[PDB]
Amino acid sequence: QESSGNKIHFINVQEGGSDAIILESNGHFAMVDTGEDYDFPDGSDSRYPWREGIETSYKHVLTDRVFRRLKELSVQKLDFILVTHTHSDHIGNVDELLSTYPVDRVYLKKYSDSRITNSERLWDNLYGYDKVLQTATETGVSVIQNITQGDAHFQFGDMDIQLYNYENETDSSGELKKIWDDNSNSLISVVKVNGKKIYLGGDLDNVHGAEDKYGPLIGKVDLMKFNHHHDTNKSNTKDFIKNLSPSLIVQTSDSLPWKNGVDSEYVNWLKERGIERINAASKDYDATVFDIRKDGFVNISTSYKPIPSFQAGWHKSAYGNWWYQAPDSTGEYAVGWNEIEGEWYYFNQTGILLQNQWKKWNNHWFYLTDSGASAKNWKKIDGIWYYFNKENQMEIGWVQDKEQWYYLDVDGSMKTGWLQYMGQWYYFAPSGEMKMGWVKDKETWYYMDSTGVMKTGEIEVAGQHYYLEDSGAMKQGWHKKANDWYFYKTDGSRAVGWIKDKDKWYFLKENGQLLVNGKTPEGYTVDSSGAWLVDVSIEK
Numbered sequence: 043q044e045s046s047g048n049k050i051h052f053i054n055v056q057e058g059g060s061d062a063i064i065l066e067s068n069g070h071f072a073m074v075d076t077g078e079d080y081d082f083p084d085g086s087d088s089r090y091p092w093r094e095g096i097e098t099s100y101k102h103v104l105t106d107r108v109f110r111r112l113k114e115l116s117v118q119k120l121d122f123i124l125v126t127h128t129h130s131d132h133i134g135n136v137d138e139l140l141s142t143y144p145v146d147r148v149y150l151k152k153y154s155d156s157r158i159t160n161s162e163r164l165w166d167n168l169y170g171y172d173k174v175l176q177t178a179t180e181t182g183v184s185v186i187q188n189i190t191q192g193d194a195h196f197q198f199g200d201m202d203i204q205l206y207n208y209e210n211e212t213d214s215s216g217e218l219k220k221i222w223d224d225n226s227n228s229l230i231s232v233v234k235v236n237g238k239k240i241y242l243g244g245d246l247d248n249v250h251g252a253e254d255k256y257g258p259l260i261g262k263v264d265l266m267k268f269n270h271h272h273d274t275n276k277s278n279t280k281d282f283i284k285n286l287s288p289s290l291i292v293q294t295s296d297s298l299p300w301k302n303g304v305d306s307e308y309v310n311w312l313k314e315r316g317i318e319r320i321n322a323a324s325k326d327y328d329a330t331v332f333d334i335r336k337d338g339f340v341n342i343s344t345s346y347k348p349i350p351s352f353q354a355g356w357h358k359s360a361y362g363n364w365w366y367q368a369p370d371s372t373g374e375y376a377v378g379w380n381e382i383e384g385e386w387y388y389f390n391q392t393g394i395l396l397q398n399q400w401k402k403w404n405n406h407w408f409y410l411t412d413s414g415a416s417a418k419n420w421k422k423i424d425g426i427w428y429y430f431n432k433e434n435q436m437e438i439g440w441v442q443d444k445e446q447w448y449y450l451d452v453d454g455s456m457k458t459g460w461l462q463y464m465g466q467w468y469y470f471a472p473s474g475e476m477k478m479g480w481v482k483d484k485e486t487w488y489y490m491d492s493t494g495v496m497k498t499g500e501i502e503v504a505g506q507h508y509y510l511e512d513s514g515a516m517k518q519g520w521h522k523k524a525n526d527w528y529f530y531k532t533d534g535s536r537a538v539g540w541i542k543d544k545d546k547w548y549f550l551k552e553n554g555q556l557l558v559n560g561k562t563p564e565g566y567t568v569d570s571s572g573a574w575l576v577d578v579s580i581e582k
């Protein structure tokens with residue numbers, strides 16, 4: 043007849059892989075996935091702990107591109123948002139979209155962290171999933187989580203849409219069947235219009251037999267979105283592509299088909315088949331766009347406005363805060379940790395630079411200085427010395443720096459004075475360094491060995507002898523070792539020959555032992571205490 047047109051916009055990545063797809067049909071708009079969003083959980087909420095691999099790079103955020111395309115299309119409302127799975131690069135902008143546009147319904151299969159067998163593949167799935175459910179209820183939007191056969195087949199404008207892999211698969215106890223990764227759970231969408239079929243399968247893989255199962259059921263299509271961006275290890279199996287036999291494959295990725303490197307053999311196998319393969323990646327246009335005509339798909343991408351220019355660098359908001367647009371971005375702003383000209387800066391999820399504050403991140407403490415730059419090496423904060431390692435983490439415990447040892451307390455604060463560490467005693471200077479050798483604390487001397495350990499008992503250093511008491515304190519004056527008396531001088535050193543103590547003269551032998559009841563080398567007499575009997579005449 044005469045509708046206003048049928049189009050599909052695959053939002054272009056800057057790099058990496060992410061799915062956001064706009065369906066346009068006779069003035070109706072809907073989305074299949076929504077791309078990566080700026081937002082992410084920082085670990086401050088125990089429900090959504092920080093996990094290695096959660097996306098924080100502006101290079102992977104599709105938010106600007108999604109909302110620019112919708113605005114450029116004069117979208118007033120979305121008939122539906124379909125979410126294929128809970129990965130941030132698919133579900134990311136759903137809540138932002140629900141906050142921005144009226145939405146009639148969201149398709150969202152059940153998820154829980156428990157149904158994923160691998161701890162290492164949880165990331166921020168639940169955070170993204172909860173955002174959809176929470177924001178949908180807050181904006182009045184029905185979430186279809188229990189898709190019936192009836193639900194699975196519906197009209198959208200001129201488009202006929204059929205879903206596959208839509209059921210929640212459960213065990214005897216009604217809890218979700220376990221899978222290796224949420225990719226296996228991908229909600230499949232097949233779109234029919236103007237005699238053309240388009241397959242849209244999110245990150246579908248064959249680990250739990252999904253490609254084996256749905257290949258034969260889906261059958262011949264024209265345009266196939268590649269499953270899972272670029273992967274050929276577990277997705278896009280030969281049987282699946284033979285079953286669908288597309289003339290055109292669109293990858294939502296800047297990468298070639300990939301399996302530990304370019305999968306050149308798979309690339310060639312696709313060519314031998316006459317399949318056209320296109321990457322939805324661009325620095326210049328928000329989307330790879332096809333006009334879906336009876337006589338074929340027309341690439342109309344460049345018929346839209348190019349991405350606007352931007353001024354790179356640091357920018358100051360109206361409220362005095364800082365945000366940043368990297369010169370290698372296409373306008374997307376920095377969030378989370380970002381290395382900028384040799385310093386590390388942390389930006390919150392809305393893109394604001396944090397300054398002059400402690401920040402806990404992935405179980406370590408960081409201090410963001412005046413400029414925002416994370417502290418490195420010694421830093422004095424609120425009157426206390428702290429030490430930050432080469433990775434900006436506040437150190438605790440023993441730290442070696444510039445050929446000296448330091449100890450940082452449990453709260454990061456530098457230790458000075460006495461420390462009992464692992465059953466032994468150490469002493470740190472007021473400037474923090476662990477002291478070796480002779481150290482004066484208050485009005486007592488102590489002797490620490492080469493490793494800083496306070497010594498006890500008799501010692502010899504540089505030809506002189508000292509006695510350290512059990513507490514470590516250097517002895518001064520009289521000391522009995524076994525059956526002999528010794529005298530330690532003011533400097534601690536063991537005396538030899540004649541010494542004067544308390545107006546009496548005492549003779550210490552070669553070996554430091556006190557002569558008692560006998561004659562000195564010159565023939566003087568000493569009493570039982572070793573004191574010289576002054577009245578007794580010299581006698582040789």
Ligand SMILES: C[N+](C)(C)CCOP(=O)(O)O
Binds near residue numbers: 225245
């Ligand atoms: C969630 N994630 C983006 C960190 C992992 C990658 O997800 P996927 O697109 O490879 O399935």
Ligand SMILES: [Ca+2]
Binds near residue numbers: 082130
């Ligand atoms: Ca995100």
Ligand SMILES: [Ca+2]
Binds near residue numbers: 079133136137138
């Ligand atoms: Ca979001």
Ligand SMILES: [Zn+2]
Binds near residue numbers: 245
């Ligand atoms: Zn993905």
Ligand SMILES: [Zn+2]
Binds near residue numbers: 129224225245
């Ligand atoms: Zn995925």
